[PDB]
Amino acid sequence: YQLTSGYKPAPMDLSFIKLTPSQEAMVDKLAENAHNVWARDRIR
C-alpha cells in the first residue's frame, strides 16, 4: 500500500490471486494488436 495524493482505492482483494501463464502471456497479443492498430497509423 503506497501513499496517495487524496484518493486511496482499496475496493476488493487485489492481492488475492496471481494468474496463469495462459493469461499473463495473453497480453503479448493485446500489446501486439493494440500496438498494431497504433502501427496502422505509424505507417502514415
* Torsion region of 6: left, alpha or beta (phi above 0 gives left; psi -120 to 50 gives alpha): left
Method of structure determination: cryo-EM
Task: Give the resolution value in Å.
Answer: 3.7
CA atoms within 13 A on the CB side of 42: 6
Q: Cell 500496438 sits at which residue?
A: 35
SS3 category, 22: helix
Output Rg (C-alpha) for the chain, integer angstroms. Answer: 17
